[PDB]
C-alpha cells in the first residue's frame, strides 16, 4: 500500500501550501525532520518513505521508474495542486518526475523545490560511492559504509541496526542506477526553486544552472549555507528553513 508510506513530518504551521518531499538515495525521510520542524510558513509537510524500510516490511529494491511510481501513489492522497513537490539529492530527481507526471495529468503543483542537487546526477569510504555510481567486492564496499556509520556514537546508540542495514542496502541499489537517471527534457509550467550550497567545485557548481533548461516560467536560485550533507542539520538548517519560508512560504 503506497499510501501507508506517506509520512507527515510537520502539521500545518503557516498560511502557505504544503510540501511533499521525495527521499534521497536510501529512501529515508529522516533527513527532513529538522528542516520540517523549523519551517513556519507552510501547511502540512509530508515525506514519502521508500518501501521496505519499516520494521514490519519486507525489503524491496525497485527500479527508479517503479520508485517514482510508488511515490506518486503514496503522495496521491495530497492535493497535487495545493502543495510544493520537493526533494533533496536523488529525491530532487523523483520530485521532478512526479511534477512532470502531475503536469501531464493537468495538475499544477505550487512549485518544485530542489535542495542542492543538479538536474543530472575517508579515501576508501568515498571510493565506494564513486565506484558504486581499485575495484572491490560489493559486500566489502558495503561493510566499509556500514563500519563508518556504526563508528558514530549517534548511530550505535539510537539508530536501529535493522533500519541501518535496510537503508544501506537500498542506498547501494539506488546509487548503482543513479547514473541512468535522465530527467525528461520537458519545461515545467510551474516555478522551480533551487536552493544550492556554495562549497561546490567549479565542475559541479556549473551544472546547477542547467535547471533553466527544464523550466517554462519562473526559476529561482537561492544560496544556502553548509554543504550537501550538513545543510539539513544545525546550524545551517535553521537558515535554510528561513530562506524556504521567505521564497516559498507564508507565515
DSSP per-residue letters across 8-65: EEE---SSS-EEEEEP-TT---GGGHHHHHH--S-S-EEEEPPTT-STTS------HH
Residue with cell 563508518: 148
113 vs 91, 141, 194, 233, CA distance in Å? 10, 33, 6, 18
For the chain, counts of helices (H) and of strands (E):
9, 7
Q: Evaluate whether 61 touches 84 at the Cβ level (below 8 Å).
A: no
Burial 43-69 (b: 16+ CB within 10 A, else e): bbbbbbbbbbbeeeeeebbbebeebbb
Q: Rounded CA gap, 194 and 118, in Å? A: 9
> Which strands, in side-by-side order, build the sheet including 111-115?
6-10, 45-48, 18-22, 83-88, 111-115, 192-197, 219-224
In three-state secondary structure terms, 105 is: coil
In three-state secondary structure terms, 104 is: helix
Cell numbers representing residue 151 in the block: 563508528
Q: Given in angstroms, what resolution was this structure solved at?
A: 2.5
Elucidation method: X-ray
Q: For the beta carbon of residue 142, count every other beta carbon within 10 angstroms.
A: 18
Amino acid at each position: 500500500d503506497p499510501t501507508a508510506k506517506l509520512v507527515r513530518l510537520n502539521p500545518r504551521g503557516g498560511d502557505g501550501p504544503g510540501i511533499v518531499f521525495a527521499p534521497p538515495a536510501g529512501g529515508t525521510v529522516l533527513g527532513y525532520i529538522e528542516l520540517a520542524r523549523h519551517l513556519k510558513g507552510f501547511g502540512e509537510i509530508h515525506g514519502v518513505e521508500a518501501p521496505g524500510l519499516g520494521a514490519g516490511e519486507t525489503p524491496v529494491y525497485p527500479s527508479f521508474e517503479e520508485m517514482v511510481q510508488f511515490c506518486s501513489d503514496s503522495a496521491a492522497g495530497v492535493a497535487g495542486d495545493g502543495v510544493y513537490i520537493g526533494g533533496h539529492a536523488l529525491g530532487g530527481h523523483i520530485a521532478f518526475y512526479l511534477a512532470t507526471m502531475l503536469l501531464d495529468r493537468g495538475i499544477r503543483p505550487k512549485g518544485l523545490i530542489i535542495l542542492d542537487t543538479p538536474p543530472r546526477l575517508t579515501e576508501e569510504e568515498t571510493k565506494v560511492f564513486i565506484l558504486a555510481m581499485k575495484d572491490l567486492p560489493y559486500e566489502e564496499a558495503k561493510q566499509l559504509l556500514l563500519d563508518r556509520a556504526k563508528n558514530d556514537p549517534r548511530v550505535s546508540a539510537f539508530l536501529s541496526e535493522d533500519y541501518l542495514d535496510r537503508f544501506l542496502r537500498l542506498q547501494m541499489h539506488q546509487l548503482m542506477y543513479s547514473r541512468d537517471v535522465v530527467l525528461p527534457q520537458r519545461k515545467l509550467d510551474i516555478p522551480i526553486h533551487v536552493f544550492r550550497t556554495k562549497n561546490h567545485a567549479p565542475e559541479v557548481a556549473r551544472l546547477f544552472s542547467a535547471w533553466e533548461n527544464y523550466a517554462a516560467g519562473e526559476v529561482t536560485f537561492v544560496d544556502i549555507p553548509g554543504d550537501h550533507a550538513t545543510m539539513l542539520r544545525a546550524p545551517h538548517v535553521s537558515e535554510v528553513a528561513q530562506l524556504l519560508d521567505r521564497h516559498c512560504g507564508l507565515p
